[PDB]
Amino acid sequence: DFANTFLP
Amino acid sequence: GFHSLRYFYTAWSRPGSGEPRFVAVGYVDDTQFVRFDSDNASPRAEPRAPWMDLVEQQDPQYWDRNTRNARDAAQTYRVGLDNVRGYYNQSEAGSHTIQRMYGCDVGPHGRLLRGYDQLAYDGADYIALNEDLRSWTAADLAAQNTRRKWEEAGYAERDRAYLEGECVEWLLKHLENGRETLLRADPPKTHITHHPISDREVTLRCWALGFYPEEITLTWQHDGEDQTQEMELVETRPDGNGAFQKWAALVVPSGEEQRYTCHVQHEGLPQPLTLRWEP
Amino acid sequence: EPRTPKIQVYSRHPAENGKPNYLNCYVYGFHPPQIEIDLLKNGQKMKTEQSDLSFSKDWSFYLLVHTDFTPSTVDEYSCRVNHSSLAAPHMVKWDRNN
């Protein structure tokens, strides 16, 4: 799976 | 010796004439296995390697999970491009790029050697997760905006939980399910070419074709002295069928060819090879 | 400030005429990501497949464009790349000793 993505 | 699971995101703006585009690709070692592209109609995560054609039977939720993940990712990097543009007080006229690379290096007994999660903005370091997986390094003042937010949200812990858990577990799944593709070491097919230039000057080019993985070393030697400073060494290139090609060349006096040897090192060989030119 | 693409044009297997091989245009080391890459037959665009955008450790992008091709004696093969780092499109001809 892809990881989580965090908003810059 | 280790294996790697790595993911590569690129998001970039189309200021006037479009919303930003978002592309994601995943690799196990040197083999691509998945992609996502936000430009497609109703965009889905899609397989790119043969064993990935069986994931739907082995994990029936895989494609839906990851498609939903990729589509959320595209939405947040589209906002992320605007946030960062404001950190650098840039105008809305020009295009900009966010990149992300994350994944894990795993040694033999399923043992994590290193986790990483790095971002770049317009092609330069922006923020990176530190090797201890508990802190971030920000590249400049603008990126401190991001580090402070991510510290207060405690995202390092969530990143570390992924890199130590899911990333390691999924490398193992792909390695086992994709053993035929991934756990091979195809040695290069090697030969030497000969094209003279003048009456008494010649180019010797040492070829290596069809090898996997990409790592390889070609060296020319004259009487056992290394010719690295004198050789022309092309960048390794994909052959289009999942393997790689590379050559190294040296210009040499005519009639003196047999005093030059090409040394070839690749994981798929029992022993490194020496190579002479022969009529 | 943009980084200029490097270009290799080559074939999958050592080339001979009559045999149908695979024509490759590998374009790498560039930034920003938007770029136009075409494989050309006698100056006219061939239909072609392009790889999924990816990038290297230094953040520079690389792409492979590739198509089925059959070498001959008469036909010229080139790869045309345009990118913001370039003043105008660059074309590199296929030459059966790249």
Q: What are phi and psi of B234, to 5 degrees?
A: -80, 155
Contact B80 A8 (CB under 8 A): yes
Chain B residues within an 8 Å CB radius of A5: 9, 69, 72-73, 76-77, 100
C32 upstream amide cis, omega within 30 of 0: yes
Identify all chain B residues contacting C28, using CB atoms and an 8 Å cutoff.
235
Distance CA B115, CA B2 (A): 13
CA dihedral B73, B67, B165, B119 (to 10 degrees): -30
| Facing B146 at nearest CB: one of A2, A4, A8 | A8
DSSP code at position B165: I
All residues at 6 or more sequence positions from B271 whose CB lies less than 8 Å from its CB, including other chains: none
The residue among C88, C85, C78, C92 whose CA lies nearest residue C4 is C85
- H/E stretch holding B71: helix B62-87
- The C-alpha angle with vertex C35 and arms to C31 and C37, in degrees rounded to 5, equals 130
- Give the pair of three-digit tokens for residue B170: 């999924």
The answer, for C90 touching chain B at a CB cutoff of 8 Å, is no
Cβ distance B155 to A6 less than 8 Å, yes or no, reads yes
Q: Strand, helix or coil at B197?
A: strand
HEC-encoded secondary structure of chain C: CCECCEEEEEECCCCCCCCCEEEEEEEEEEECCCCEEEEEECCEECCCEECCCEECCCCCEEEEEEEEECCCCCCCEEEEEECCCCCCCEEEECCCCC
Separation of alpha carbons C33 and B12, rounded Å: 8
Q: 155-184 in B: which are within 8 Å (CB) of A?
A: 155, 158-159, 162-163, 166-167, 170
For B102-148, the DSSP string reads EEEEEETTTEEEEEEEEEEETTEEEEEE-TTSS-EEESSHHHHHHHH
Q: Which CATH class is domain B1-184?
A: alpha beta
Place of tokens 């995560």: B45
Structure tokens at B199: 């009456």
**What is the Cα–Cα distance from C49 to C37, expressed in whole angstroms?**
10
Burial class (CB in 10 A: 0-12, 13-18, 19+), B263: middle
For B162, which DSSP code?
I
| CB C38, CB C45: distance < 8 Å | yes
Q: Are C9 and C24 in contact (CB under 8 A)?
A: yes
Of B28, B32, B34, B15, residue with least CA distance to B91: B15
DSSP string, B5-39: EEEEEEEE--SSSSPPEEEEEEEETTEEEEEEETT
CA distance C27 to B31: 18
Q: Burial-class residue C49 by CB neighbours within 10 Å (0-12, 13-18, 19+).
A: exposed
Chains B and A touch, contact meaning at least 3 pairs of CB atoms under 8 angstroms apart: yes
Which of B210, B188, B158, B215 minimizes the C-alpha distance to B4? B215
Distance CA B82, CA B232 (A): 44
Q: What residue in C sits closest to B123 (Cα-Cα)?
A: C59
**CB within 8 Å: A3 and B66:** no
- Tokens matching residue B94: 């020009």
CB-CB under 8 Å, A4 with B83: no
Cβ neighbourhood burial of B102 (10 Å; 0-12, 13-18, 19+): buried
User: Is residue B245 less than 8 Å (CB to CB) from chain C?
Assistant: yes
Chain A CB contacts of B159 under 8 Å are 3-4, 6
Helix residue ranges per DSSP H, B136-223: 141-153, 155-161, 167-177, 179-182
Boundaries of every domain in chain C? 1-98
Distance CA B214, CA B228 (A): 20
Looking only at the bridges linking them, the beta strands covering B3-12 and B97-107 are: antiparallel
Locate B63 and state its tokens. Answer: 């494609």
Give the SS3 label for residue B153.
Answer: helix
B185-275: CATH superfamily:
Immunoglobulins (2.60.40.10)
Q: What does each C-alpha distance from C48 to B186, C6, C53 come to in angstroms?
A: 27, 19, 15
Where exactly are the structural domains of chain B?
1-184, 185-275
CATH architecture of C1-98: Sandwich (2.60)
Q: Is B84 on the interface with A (CB under 8 A)?
A: yes
Distance CA B90, CA B92 (A): 7
Considering CB atoms only, which of C3, C10, C54 is closest to B237? C10
- Check CB contact under 8 Å for A2 and B159: no
- Name the DSSP class of B48: -
The encoded tokens of residue B47 equal 């397989």
Strand order of the β-sheet with C44-45 is C44-45, C36-41, C77-82, C90-93
What letter would DSSP give residue A7? Answer: -
Q: Are B24 and B8 in contact (CB under 8 A)?
A: yes
Instruction: Quickly count: other Cβ atoms within 10 Å of residue B235's Cβ.
Output: 11
Mutate to test the interface with A, among B5, B68, B76 (most CBs of A within 10 A): B76
- Whether B84 contacts B76, CB under 8 Å: no
What CA–CA distance (Å, rounded) separates C22 from C13?
7
Q: Provide the token pair at C27.
A: 């374009």
Resolution in angstroms, to 1 decimal, for this deposition?
A: 2.2
Method by which this entry was solved:
X-ray
Touch between C and B (at least 3 CB pairs under 8 Å):
yes
Question: Under the phi-then-psi rule, with left for phi > 0, alpha for psi from -120 to 50, and beta for the rest, what region is B163?
Answer: alpha
Nearest-5° Cα angle at B37, B36 to B43: 85
The backbone torsions φ and ψ at residue C63, rounded to the nearest 5 degrees and listed phi first, read -145, 150
Q: Cα separation of B214 and B4, whole Å?
A: 13
Residue window 148-177, chain B: list those with CB within 8 Å of chain C: none
**B141-153 and B62-87 helices cross at what angle (nearest 10)?**
140
Decide: A and C in contact? Rule: 3+ Cβ pairs under 8 Å: no
Contact residues on chain B for A8, CB-CB shorter than 8 A: 77, 80, 83-84, 98, 119, 121, 126-127, 146
For residue C14, what are the contacts with CB-CB under 8 A and spacing of at least 6? Answer: none
Q: How far is CA B129 from CA B83, B118, B223, in A?
A: 20, 6, 48
